[PDB]
Amino acid sequence: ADQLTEEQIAEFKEAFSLFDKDGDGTITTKELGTVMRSLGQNPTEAELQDMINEVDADGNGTIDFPEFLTMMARKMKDTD
């Protein structure tokens, strides 16, 4: 079977390699804003707060591997 895949999963691990620079392997307000900051201007703290609150359903503002595995997989049927 397709036991040894490592096709798409290789790109998930890349997130904790290109997105985070602290060596934590988690997505917080810091990594969420740093990319936008050098992509299309950084929003206000309030806007950033709401953004991480709109993703972190656990209530800590941090996404680990187990969370990321579901976050970057449960795509909606509608595209923005």
Partner: peptide, 19 residues
């Protein structure tokens, strides 16, 4: 939504992975 604004930076990551 964050679930879209998250995929966006990831798309940038994909671009970096290519570049």
């Amino acid at each position: 939504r964050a679930a879209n604004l998250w995929p966006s930076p990831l798309m940038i990551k994909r671009s970096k992975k290519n570049s």
